[PDB]
Amino acid sequence: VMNRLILAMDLMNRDDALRVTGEVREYIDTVKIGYPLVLSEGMDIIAEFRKRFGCRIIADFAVADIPETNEKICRATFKAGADAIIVHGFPGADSVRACLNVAEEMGREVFLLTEMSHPGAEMFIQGAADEIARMGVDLGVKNYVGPSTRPERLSRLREIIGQDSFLISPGVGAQGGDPGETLRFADAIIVGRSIYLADNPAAAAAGIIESIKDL
């Protein structure tokens, strides 16, 4: 990913989302779009972004249903032009395999979310996260998401998935994570509010990239 930085575009207005992404485009080449933007503006926003910016799009849909429904969600998401989808591992292996099957059929990718970045992840998810990551390895998952807010957990995840898997990490900036520390273990960092709520998003992105280039 360009500069190892993925923009989390969670503004809920098409005009604002387009303006901020355009302003930071020279620093990124992957945008993560989630339900805040899609539920406000529609699935067509994915193809619009892909066309206007020529970026890769990761659909952060935190997919977390039964296998049949997960299949339908993945099929709608890739039909809309997303390059990859983020899927929860907590619902178990059949739910994840449903997503992997559709990604195989459509030439796309699944990212497995293993431990979440927020405080509540400590309640249930963290205790399952090593096993979720091991399940990923055993299903042949090659792309993973783990938390910037806990780099010792990010280290342990990297250890489970090995050096050839690709690992991206949210929770940088607003949630407390550090870019440079997170990039010791992740291949790329995801940044939302620290860029898109900034008075000058391009300067915010540039400042992050500057602290990165040093590593």
Ligand X SMILES: Nc1cc(=O)[nH]c(=O)n1[C@@H]1O[C@H](COP(=O)(O)O)[C@@H](O)[C@H]1O
Stretch that binds a copy of itself, among 17-25, 34-42, 99-107, 157-165 (CB under 8 A): 34-42
Residues 6+ apart with CB under 8 A from 213: none
Q: Of the candidates 60, 58, 27, 4, which has an alpha carbon nearest to the alpha carbon of residue 184?
A: 4
Q: Does the footprint of ligand X cover residue 126 (CB under 6 A)?
A: no
Counting DSSP H helices and E strands in the chain, the numbers are 10, 8
Q: Does the footprint of a copy of itself cover residue 198 (CB under 8 A)?
A: no
CA dihedral 43, 115, 110, 89 (to 10 degrees): -100
User: Which tokens sit at 111?
Assistant: 């990212």
> Dihedrals φ, ψ of 108, to 5°?
-120, -175
Task: Select the binding partner of residue 190 from a copy of itself, ligand X, none (C-beta < 5 to 8 A, by kind).
Answer: ligand X
Q: Does the footprint of ligand X cover residue 89 (CB under 6 A)?
A: no
Q: Does the footprint of ligand X cover residue 170 (CB under 6 A)?
A: yes
Which one of 13, 52, 69, 122 is in contact with ligand X (CB under 6 A)? 69
User: Under the rule (CB under 8 A), what is the footprint of a copy of itself?
Assistant: 10, 12, 34-36, 38-40, 42-43, 61-62, 64-69, 72-73, 76-77, 80, 88-96, 116-125, 128, 131-132, 135, 174-175, 193
